[PDB]
Design a protein around this ligand. Sequence first.
Ligand SMILES: O=P(O)(O)OC[C@H]1O[C@H](O)[C@H](O)[C@@H](O)[C@@H]1O
Length: 294
Amino acid sequence: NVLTVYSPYQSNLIRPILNEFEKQEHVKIEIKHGSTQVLLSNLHNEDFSERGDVFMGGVLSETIDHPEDFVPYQDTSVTQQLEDYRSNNKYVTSFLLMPTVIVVNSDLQGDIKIRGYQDLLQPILKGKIAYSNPNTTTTGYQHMRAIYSMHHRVSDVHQFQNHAMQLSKTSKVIEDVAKGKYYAGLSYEQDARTWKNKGYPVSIVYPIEGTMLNVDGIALVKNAHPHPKRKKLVQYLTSRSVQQRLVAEFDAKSIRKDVSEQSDQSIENLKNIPLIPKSKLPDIPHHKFLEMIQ
Ligand SMILES: O=P(O)(O)OC[C@H]1O[C@H](O)[C@H](O)[C@@H](O)[C@@H]1O
């Protein structure tokens, strides 16, 4: 009866729409939360008969190390998706566009200028910047790729890491920045928005050197007795009306062509974000990049 979803998303983003799916389709949805790679690693070791049914969130098209744990499937509505961000991974349907961001505490900042990654290296900020474990999280990994992409120099990654404090959990970064434990941190757009809209002194910075754009994905998990409504769930999550609801309520960035663009207040439209072009981000497997920067 229960349909289990694995997701690194925070509850506030996905619990409501999953409740509306419960209300429309009369299925109970339980969420298993965790860091992207921790979820994938525990799923891999999870017994085949106990597994959940859907994985949503994270850059799945690029960081699924065990494709045998998933079913080859893409929703038909990929036809309606933005041309540049369709999954090239037969196990993954693109779901949302998630800019990675720098978050700055605007009560501690004072006159310190923070426009991007280079500014984080100012001596006054040493040891007062936070990021999440690149080995276990989408957000930390994507930021390390963004720093490497500037000049394709591992030394740039190491220089940042020697300047900053690594935390286990991506959401601890925004929490501790918002609460004044750190001057700034490496986060992602929706997590930063959540805390700014709760009134915390948080500024959202799209790094001028190049902002990584995560293409979040959805995948069907290989298990013994798949819940027969899981393909309806993927359809629901990638549908126009549901994507439009996520844009309207959260300033999400829809994967679909036929859905509004909304970037209220300090959130930026993609056209005003300096995105790292794909040409600066070549093919290098997840595990090889982590080995490169170790
Ligand atoms: O804890 P994480 O592995 O960093 O995942 C938390 C979030 O961060 C990433 O940047 C992805 O864009 C999101 O889809 C994901 O839900």
